[PDB]
Amino acid sequence: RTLGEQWKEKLNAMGKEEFFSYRKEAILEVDRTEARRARREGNKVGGHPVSRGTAKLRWLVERRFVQPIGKVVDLGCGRGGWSYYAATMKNVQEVRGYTKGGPGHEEPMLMQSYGWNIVTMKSGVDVFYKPSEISDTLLCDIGESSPSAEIEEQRTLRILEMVSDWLSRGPKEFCIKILCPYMPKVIEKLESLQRRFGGGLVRVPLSRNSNHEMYWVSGASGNIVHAVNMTSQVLIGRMDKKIWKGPKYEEDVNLGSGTRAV
Numbered sequence: 001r002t003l004g005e006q007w008k009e010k011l012n013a014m015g016k017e018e019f020f021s022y023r024k025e026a027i028l029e030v031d032r033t034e035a036r037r038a039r040r041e042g043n044k045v046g047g048h049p050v051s052r053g054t055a056k057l058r059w060l061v062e063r064r065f066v067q068p069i070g071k072v073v074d075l076g077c078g079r080g081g082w083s084y085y086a087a088t089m090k091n092v093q094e095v096r097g098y099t100k101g102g103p104g105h106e107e108p109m110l111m112q113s114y115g116w117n118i119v120t121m122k123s124g125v126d127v128f129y130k131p132s133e134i135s136d137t138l139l140c141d142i143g144e145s146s147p148s149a150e151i152e153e154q155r156t157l158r159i160l161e162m163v164s165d166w167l168s169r170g171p172k173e174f175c176i177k178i179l180c181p182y183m184p185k186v187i188e189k190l191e192s193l194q195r196r197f198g199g200g201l202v203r204v205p206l207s208r209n210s211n212h213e214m215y216w217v218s219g220a221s222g223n224i225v226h227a228v229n230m231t232s233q234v235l236i237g238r239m240d241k242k243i244w245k246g247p248k249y250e251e252d253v254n255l256g257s258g259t260r261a262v
């Protein structure tokens with residue numbers, strides 16, 4: 001069994017005290033106090049992202065791992081961190097988000113960030129049963145953690161099934177969350193999908209150590225197995241610390257406000 005599987009079982013044997021110290025050890029982090037402490041203040045235009053997801057997408061975009069353009073489809077948009085971030089970019093003509101919403105899942109929040117006007121987010125949409133549509137940029141950030149690697153594997157495999165349908169419609173810019181990249185069956189489907197659609201897997205340092213999520217991005221390249229093992233080793237390397245030095249903090253993105261005519 002793989003290093004990720006070993007990391008996983010090791011993650012689950014930890015106590016609560018250690019788990020909480022561990023999951024944010026040496027990771028990158030944005031302070032959300034400002035964001036959340038400007039909900040009741042009734043401010044749609046302070047540039048405060050709706051989620052931590054925006055900073056994740058920025059990290060990738062900044063490094064040219066994906067370059068949003070044209071019609072953007074955002075699968076499992078949730079609150080809209082990714083959809084609104086895309087909306088601020090000048091090559092983006094349209095942003096269409098879909099999320100399931102409902103009990104125990106995020107709905108699309110209203111915001112008035114820069115270019116919010118080209119954003120349409122529909123809740124009550126299970127993407128597993130949404131016919132695909134042509135897009136230029138396909139974003140997908142779906143994947144529910146579970147203590148069981150096997151469940152995350154089945155969940156990942158299921159997501160990789162439908163993503164493939166949307167990718168077959170032409171989008172050359174893409175960014176797909178891979179919940180459990182370290183299980184063998186997942187590696188096998190990913191090699192096949194890479195063979196066909198290109199791209200690579202990238203670890204975003206804003207991800208917590210309690211998860212192994214990697215992003216399949218059009219702007220990346222290289223050997224998946226190796227990329228995945230490198231991430232597993234880093235995650236294991238952060239275990240068993242005597243002194244927990246905590247995370248390193250980053251200023252959140254400023255998404256501004258107003259509209260744009262495209």
Ligand SMILES: Nc1nc2c(ncn2[C@@H]2O[C@H](COP(=O)(O)OP(=O)(O)OP(=O)(O)O)[C@@H](O)[C@H]2O)c(=O)[nH]1
Nearest residue numbers: 011012013014015016019145146147148208210211
């Ligand atoms: N040892 C230990 N492992 C845990 C515990 N809670 C979760 N895990 C493991 O960590 C994995 C993912 O943790 P999450 O808490 O979902 O990760 P997160 O993104 O920080 O989630 P939120 O902070 O709840 O939004 C789970 O699938 C478990 O394998 C815990 O109390 N103890």
Ligand SMILES: Nc1ncnc2c1ncn2[C@@H]1O[C@H](CSCC[C@H](N)C(=O)O)[C@@H](O)[C@H]1O
Nearest residue numbers: 051053076077078081082099100105126127
């Ligand atoms: N089958 C499904 N169909 C549509 N959305 C789903 C889904 N399964 C999970 N999701 C949604 O996918 C979302 C991922 S979290 C969305 C984060 C977003 N990128 C942001 O920046 O805010 C969750 O809210 C969840 O409700």
